[PDB]
Point group: D2
Chain length 512, copies 4
C-alpha cells in the first residue's frame, strides 16, 4: 500500500525548525519532537520557498504546481481559473480520493457559478476537486459548530474566544491564555478530523491533506501553551533603527510599515504593528512558538495512529507551510512584500520504508510548485504538462539533479483588495502592482513592475537592509540577475497545448 | 430570516405515516410524534410519489426537478449528466449555501473526470454543487470513522455491526437488537451532524438537506428499538397465494420474485425474499417501525434546537423519502418494479409562521419533481425552465390549483447493473428495459417499452392483483390511459432552450 | 478511395420520383433522367420519411441522427443545443472534411455566443462543425452576390427576381418565367460551387453535402423551365369539398387552412393558399416540376464531372430531401401538420461499385435519422451511441434486417414563432403544441399532446379524410397504436451516458 | 452606417511603403497608388510591428489582441487555445458578421475536436468564430478549384503554376513570368471574393477581413508584373561580408543562415538562401515589388466599388501585414529570428469621413495587438479585459496619448516543427526555445531564454551588425533594457479573471 499525508501548516517560518537550528549550532529555542522525528527519518529542505503569498495565492501554487504568473490567483479574493489542473483532480486520475482537512482559500471562477454564490462573500472556499473531510468552513463555521456541539458556550462574537483571559486583559501581545481550552482548540479539531478519516479508511490506501490553521494569528494560545516559552529566550526581531528609516527603502515597504494594524494579529488589539516594542515582539514570538508546539503535539496523535496500525512505513509524509511570517522583522507582521521571512518555509519529506538519506539536510533550491509533481510522481502518475514545478523524488535517493534550478523564485501581487488598498498610495493601476524575486546563496534581486527594483548582497547584508540596485558599481550584477529572471519568465510561459503539433501525419506531440 | 430544512429519509412508505392512518380511522401502529407535530402544523400530502426508483434515480429526480426521461440517471451506477441544473447550484443562485447531510448516490459524468476516479467504484457519491457537512461517504466510511473515533471497536467486516446480537443469532428477520448501541447508530450520526451545522450557523439563514439512511435495510435496530413493536400488531403483507401465481402476472414480477435475496435486507442472511413467512414478515415490519421511530426521536433533537433558538417559525420544513419499500407486498422486498408501495412516499410541509392549512391532508397528486421548484419558489428564485415539476406553494395557501395534474406519473428502468441483471431473462436490450406508470383514483396503467402492459381497476383491485390490459372489454379505457401517458411524454420533452427564438429583432424568449 | 456525395434538395415530395411512379404503372409526368440513373444503379426507398418539419427541425434530424424529441430544435428559429453530435463533427472523427453547399437553417445555442450575434436575426445559419464551400448565406446573400458579380443587375428588392416576367404580370401561380436567367439561377449557383469544390479536391477523398434550394418556393422557374410541363398533365390535388369541411377535421388543420398565405409561395402574391382553384394548383404543380427538372439538369453536370474523373464508382451517392410539400393537398401549401405529403421524401442510395440491389425499390420503413448512421458506417466510423437512427447499409446488400422497425414515425411542433403563431387560436401553452405520428401499411395514428388524436384506415382512406379515433369500434386499434407510439417514446429516451456503469472494477460500458 | 475593411497582406515589409519613403526623401522605387490614397487620406504608422512571426503566431496576435506570451500559439503547427476571445467572436458581440477572406493559419485546440480532424494535417485552418466568404483553404484548394472552374488547365502538381515560364527555365530568382495568367492569379481570386461579398451585402453594414497571400512567396509574378521593376532600381540587401561572419553573431543566426533553402522561396529551386548573389537578390526584390503592385491594383478594384456605392466615407479601412520578410537582409529569407525587417510592418488607417490627421505619419510605437482593440473601440464595443493591446483611435484625432508605450515589443519561439528543427543544433529543450525583443529609437535588446542576449546601438548600428551585450561598458544600458522587458512581462500576465473580487458585498469587479 502507498499512502500520502500532506501536512500543510499556515504561517510557519523556515527558521523555526529545530533540526536546522541544531545543524547550524544555534539554540533550538522551541520544541517540536514530532517534526523532529520526520527530520531524523527523512530529508529536510532548508532552502524551500512558497512562490507567492498570502494564503490564497500560496495554496494555488501548492495545489496546481504553477507559478502565480500562470495560475493568476494573484491575491486573496481573486478567482482561480477553472482551467488549471489541481492536485485533487490529478489525484482522482491515479485512483486516489483527494481527502482534505483545513481549507484552500480559493475563490471560484465566476464563469462556473452564479454571481450570487455565497462563496463570493468570503476570502475563499474549498477548491473544486477535493473531498472535504474536515473543513474549517468559511468564517470557521465548521470549527465553531464543533466547539458548540462539544458543549462549550461561545461568546456572542465567536472570535472573542481569542481575547486574552480575564475581563481586565489588554488585547495585543499577551502572557495570558486564550479563552478556549486546549481540548476545544482549532488544532485539536483538525486532528480529530484526521483521526476520524484515517479510522474510516481502515487500512485502505489514502491521500490526506492535513491542514492546520496554526500558527496563523491571532497570536494567543490555549493553556498551557501560552506560557511554555519565555520571551527572553526568543530570537530577536531584525529591523531598522526606526519605522521611517525602514520605510525609506521602498514605497511598498512604506505602505505596509504604515498600514499594518495590530488587530490583524491579536484579537481586539489597537494600534500599529510597527510600533510594537522589543518586549512585545518577544512575547508574540513566544506565543507563536506555543502555537507551534500545540500543532506538533497534535501531529504526534496522528503519527501514533499510523504507528499503531502499521502504516508509517507505507506513508509518504510531506510537512510544509503555505508561507512564512515577518514576525516583526522589518517592522512588519504578516506575509507581504519581498523579504525572505515571508517566503521561506519548512519542507520535510519522509519516504516509505527506511529512507536513503534519512537525517539529511538539503540546500538545493526548492519551491512549493514542486510538491504536486512530487506527490503525483510518487503515486506513479504523469506530471501534468502544464506544471511549472518538478518532482523532488531524486533528492530522496541520489540527491540534487545536475540540471536542477540554481536560483529561487517567487512573486507578489499587491493590487487592491477589500481590506488592503495600496494602489492610490503607490500611484499604480491594478495590472502594474506586482514584483518578482530571484535569489541564490549570494544575491537577491527584487524586480517591481512599476516601482524601483532592489538588490541585496546576502553575504554582507543577509537581512536585506541595503539596496544596491541603483549603485553603478553593481550594474553588471543587477544586469545579470534581471537577465536570469527574464529567462525564467520566458521559460515558464503557459504550456497547456504547446507540445502539440499538426503536420502531414496528423496530430502529434513533442516530448523534448 | 428564511430557512429551509429538507428532511429526506430513505425507504419510508407513505402508509407508515400516523396522521394519515388516524385520518382514515386506521390503527396507528407506529409512533412518530415529531413527524406528527409537522403534520399538525403543516400540510400532509397523501398522494405523493417518487418519480422513479431506486435511490440514485430517485435522488436525481428530487434534486433536479426532472423526470427520469429527462435526467437519464436511469439506475444506480448510471451517470448523471452534468448539464442538468441541480438544487445545490440553484440554491447558490439565490445566495444560499447548499449544505447537505447524508448522501445523493450520484455517479459523476465521465466527461468531467478521469475514468480512474474512485467515485466510479461505488454506487454513487455526492452530487456536484452541494456542500457536504455530514456525509455517509462511500462505503459509509464517514459513519464508521465517527463510530471508531467515538471509541467503539468495530468488527473486521464493519457491516457485521448489523448482525443480530449473539454468536448464536440466525441472520434474517430478528427479535434481537443489532450489535451497535443507539448512541453510535447511523441515525445518531446524521443528527449530530445536523446539530453541529446548525450551531455553526448561529442564527444565519440556512438551507440544509438532512438525510437519514433509515429505515433503509438492514432491518435490524439498536436496542431498545428492536423490541418496541410487536409483530402481531403490524399490518399484514399483501401478496398472492404463492410466489408462482404472483410471478405469473408479468415477466418483470417473475424476475424479482425469483431473484431477490434475503441478504440484501438482513445482514448475513441466506435464502430468497419471496419465501419469508408471515411471522418473519411481521417481525421485519416491526423492526422497520423501530427504525422509523429512532429517526423520529432523532428529529426531535433537531426540532428542539430550532425551538430553543427561535427559528422554528422562520423555517420551511419539508419531510419526505427518496422512495418506498415493498416490505413483503407481492412477495417482494425493496424498491423495484411498478407497485404503489415502492413509489408512494410521505410528504409533509410546514411553512414559516402559522400555516393557513395547518393539519390539512391534501389528495392532489404530487410528485418528487415538485420539491425543488417549491424550495426555489419559496426562497424567491426563478424556477428553472428545464424543471418538469411545479411549485407546491399554492397548496399551502389556497389549495390545489385548478389546472394541476390529474394523474400521478412514475418510471422504472431495469437495465443490467452489476448486482442485478434481468436482461437475459427478459430477452431485452439495454434501451428497451423501461416502463412508465400513470394513475389516478380509479385506474392504474403500467406501460412497458418491450413487454406486456398492465392495467388495474383500483376501486375493485386496490392491490394490483388482476391485470385487465388484455381484456377486450377494457380496450377504450386502456386506450385512454395509454393516450394520457403519451401526451405526458410529449409535454415533457426537454425544455433547455425551447423558449428561445431568433427573429428580426434578434434573440428573444417566449414566456407562454 | 471512398467518397460521399449527400444531395439534399428542399421541399421535394416522394411521389414526384419517376422510378417509383413507373414501378406502380403510373404516368411519370416529370422528367428526372439523372435521378433516374441513381435509381437504376442503386436502391430506391419508397417509404422514407423526414422525422419532422419544417427545414430547421428536419435538417437537425438529418444532421444529428436524432428525433425531434431528442434534438429539441423544434421549430424554425429555435436553437439547436450544442451538445448533440452532428454529422460535420462526426465526419472529422473519421478524417473527412465536412464540406457543405447550401444551408442547414440552424439557430446557434445562446450559451455559446453573444446575444447580439447576427445569426440570431435570421431563421438559422450554418450548423457548427461544417466546412462551408457554397453557402446560400442568410438572406441568400451568397447567391445574390454571385449574381451581381456575374454582372446581372438585380432589382432593388432582390427577391423580386422571382416576380413573373412582365410589368403586367399578376403575382401567384404563373405561366410566365421568372425574371432571372437560367445561367444565374440558384440551382446553377449551387452546382458551380460543387464543381469548384470537386475540382479543388483533385481526386482526393471527399465528403460533400450538396444542398439545393429548389424546389422550395417561390414557385416560379427560369425559362424555359416555366413552360416545360403542361398544367393538364399534372396530378390533381387531393382535398375535401371545401376549406370549411377540410378544416373541420381538427383544429390544427383549421389553423393552417385559415392562415396560410399565397405570398409565402409565390413572390408578391396576395390572398389565401386555400382559395387557389384547380387550374391554379395545376399550374403551380407544373412550375414545381420545372424546378425539379432544373435541379436534375444541374445534377447531370456534377455527375458528368464524377464520370470524367473516374470517381463515380468510388462514390456513395445519397439523394434525399429535407421534407415534402402539401402542394395543395388538403387545401394546404407548405410543410406543416400531420399529412403524409409533408413528411414522405425521396431517398435513393447508390453504393460504390456495381450495386447488389441495383434498380430495387425498398418498402422497408426508413427515416431521415438513418442517413447519418449510414454515412458513418460506410466510412468505417462508429455510429454514435446517442443516434436514434440505424445504418441502412444492410438494405444495399441483403435487404431489410429481420428486426427492422415495423412503423414509421414523425413529429411536429407548432409552438409560436415570429411568422406563425397558432397558440392563441388553439388555446395552448408553448410546451403543449406538439404531435407525433406512427404509421404502417394499414393504419396511421396522429397523437396530439393537448388536442384530439386522429386515426386513419389507410387502405380505405389513403388520403386521410376520415378520422376514426373517436369511433368506439376502433378503440382496440387506437389503443394498439397509442401503445406502439408510447413504447417508441420510452425506447428513444436520451442515450448520452446511459451505457456507462460504476462498479467494483471501476468505470465500464455496457454494449448490449 | 459604419463599415470596417481590415486588409491583411502577407509578408509585406514596412520599408516598402512609398508614402514613408517619400517622406524621408528616399526614392520610392515601387508603385502603390491605392495604398498611397489611404496614406493621403489617413494616418500612416511608421513604427508598427507584428508581435511575433511567422504567419500562425502573427495572426493569433492580430486576431486576439494578445502577445505570444498569452496566446501560446507559439509557432506554425501549434494549437491555439479556445479560451482566448478572438476578433470574430468579439465582432458578433457588437452585432457584426465576421466575414473573412484569405486565411488565419490556426491549428484547432485538440480538446475541442477529434484527433483525426483533417485540420490537423496542415499548418492551420480557419480560426473558430469567423465567417468564411473566400477561403484559400488548406493546400489552397479554394484557389485552385476556382482556377480550374474558370477553365484554366492546371499542372499535375498544382504549385508548378509558379515555375517560371518555359521548359528551359531555371527555378529560383527569375526575370520570367509565372505560368498563371493575371486573371487567374491568387490576388485576383481574393479580390473577386471581396467584390462578391460586398455586392451581396448591398449597402448593409459590414466587417470584412480582406486577406491577400501576396507578397508571400514564391517570388514569381504573373505577366507583366514580373517585368515591371528593374533589378538595378531596387534597394540593396544589407548583409555581412559573408555567411560565416553573419552566422557568428549568434547561434540562432547560424541556424537559419545554414538551413534556409531557396526552394522555400522560389518554386522548384535548389540550394541555400544564403548563397544568393547580389544580382539574384535584386531580381527577387523586383519580383517582390511586382507582387506588391498586383495587390495594389486589385485593391483599386475594391476601393472603386466602395466609391461607386458611396461607402468610402463610411468605412474604417486598416491596411497591414501579418509580418515582414528579410528579403536577403542578413543572409536570410523569410520571417524568422530577431531582425527588424521580419517584424516591422505597414499600418495605415483611414477613418470614416474627412480624417483630422489626413496624411500624417505617426512615429509612436504600435504593435499588431492594438488592431483588434481599435476595431472594437470604433464599433462601440468594450475592449476585452484580456487584450494586451490598446485602441489606436486617439492617434486618429489628437495624437499619441501621453501615457502610450515608449518601447516596441516582440517575441519569437523557435521550437521544433515538422519542417524546421533547430533544437538539436542549439542544444535546447522545447520550452527553452524563445526570445523577446524590446526597442526604442536608440537601442534594441534581444533576450533569449537559454542562449546569449544581443544589444544594438541603433544610431550607430541601425542594421544590427554589432552585438554589444557582452561589452562591460554597456552593462548599465543592458541592465536598463533587461529591466524594462522584465517589467513588461509582469505587466502583461494573463488578465482573464484578475479584475474580479470576492468580499463582504459579494462578487465585484475592479475597474482601475
Amino acid at each position: 500500500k502507498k499512502n500520502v499525508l500532506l501536512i500543510v501548516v499556515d504561517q510557519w517560518r523556515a527558521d523555526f525548525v529545530p533540526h536546522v537550528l541544531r545543524a547550524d549550532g544555534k539554540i533550538d529555542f522551541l520544541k517540536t519532537p514530532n517534526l523532529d522525528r520526520l527530520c531524523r527519518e527523512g530529508v529536510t529542505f532548508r532552502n524551500h520557498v512558497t512562490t507567492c503569498v498570502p494564503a490564497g495565492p500560496a495554496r494555488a501554487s501548492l495545489l496546481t504546481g504553477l507559478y502565480l504568473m500562470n495560475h493568476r490567483a494573484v491575491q486573496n479574493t481573486v478567482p482561480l481559473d477553472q482551467r488549471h489542473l489541481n492536485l485533487g483532480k490529478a489525484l482522482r486520475g491515479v485512483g486516489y480520493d483527494p481527502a482534505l482537512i483545513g481549507y484552500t482559500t480559493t475563490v471560484p471562477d465566476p464563469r462556473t457559478t452564479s454571481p450570487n454564490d455565497p462563496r463570493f462573500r468570503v476570502l475563499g472556499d474549498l477548491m473544486d476537486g477535493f473531498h472535504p473531510v474536515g473543513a474549517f468552513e468559511p468564517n470557521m463555521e465548521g470549527y465553531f459548530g464543533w466547539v458548540a456541539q462539544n458543549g462549550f458556550d461561545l461568546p456572542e462574537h465567536r472570535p472573542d474566544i481569542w481575547l486574552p483571559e480575564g475581563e481586565d486583559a489588554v488585547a495585543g501581545a499577551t502572557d495570558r491564555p486564550s479563552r478556549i481550552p486546549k481540548e476545544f482548540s482549532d488544532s485539536t479539531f483538525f486532528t480529530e478530523r484526521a483521526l476520524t478519516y484515517l479510522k474510516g479508511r481502515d487500512g485502505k490506501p489514502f491521500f490526506l491533506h492535513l491542514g492546520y490553521y496554526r500558527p496563523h494569528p491571532p497570536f494567543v494560545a490555549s493553556a498551557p501553551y501560552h506560557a511554555m516559552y519565555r520571551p527572553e529566550d526568543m530570537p530577536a526581531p531584525i529591523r531598522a533603527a526606526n519605522p521611517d528609516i525602514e520605510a525609506a527603502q521602498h514605497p511598498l515597504m512604506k505602505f505596509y510599515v504604515d498600514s499594518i494594524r495590530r488587530g490583524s494579529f491579536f484579537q481586539g488589539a489597537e494600534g500599529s504593528g510597527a510600533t510594537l516594542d522589543e518586549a512585545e515582539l518577544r512575547q508574540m514570538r513566544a506565543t507563536y512558538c506555543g502555537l507551534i508546539t500545540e500543532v506538533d503535539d497534535c501531529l504526534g496523535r496522528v503519527f501514533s495512529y499510523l504507528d499503531e496500525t502499521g502504516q508509517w512505513d507505507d506513508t509518504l509524509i510531506i510537512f510544509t507551510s503555505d508561507h512564512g511570517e515577518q514576525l516583526g522583522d522589518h517592522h512588519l507582521l504578516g506575509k507581504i512584500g519581498y523579504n525572505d521571512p515571508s517566503f521561506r518555509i519548512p519542507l520535510v519529506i519522509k519516504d516509505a520504508g527506511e529512507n536513503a538519506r534519512a537525517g539529511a539536510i538539503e540546500s538545493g533550491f526548492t519551491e512549493s510548485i514542486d510538491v504536486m509533481p512530487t506527490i503525483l510522481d510518487w503515486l506513479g502518475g504523469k506530471i501534468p504538462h502544464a506544471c511549472d514545478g518538478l518532482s523532488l523524488l531524486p533528492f530522496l535517493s541520489e540527491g540534487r539533479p545536475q540540471d536542477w534550478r540554481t536560483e529561487l523564485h517567487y512573486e507578489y501581487d499587491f493590487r487592491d483588495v477589500y481590506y488592503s488598498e495600496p494602489q492610490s498610495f503607490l500611484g499604480l493601476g491594478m495590472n502594474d502592482c506586482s514584483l518578482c524575486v530571484i535569489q541564490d546563496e549570494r544575491y537577491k534581486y527584487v524586480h517591481f513592475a512599476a516601482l524601483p527594483p532592489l538588490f541585496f548582497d546576502l553575504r554582507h547584508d543577509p537581512n536585506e537592509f541595503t539596496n544596491l540596485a541603483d549603485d553603478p558599481a553593481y550594474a553588471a550584477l543587477v544586469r545579470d540577475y534581471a537577465q536570469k529572471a527574464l529567462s525564467w519568465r520566458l521559460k515558464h510561459a503557459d504550456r497547456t497545448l504547446t507540445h502539440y503539433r499538426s503536420g502531414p501525419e496528423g496530430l502529434s506531440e513533442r516530448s523534448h
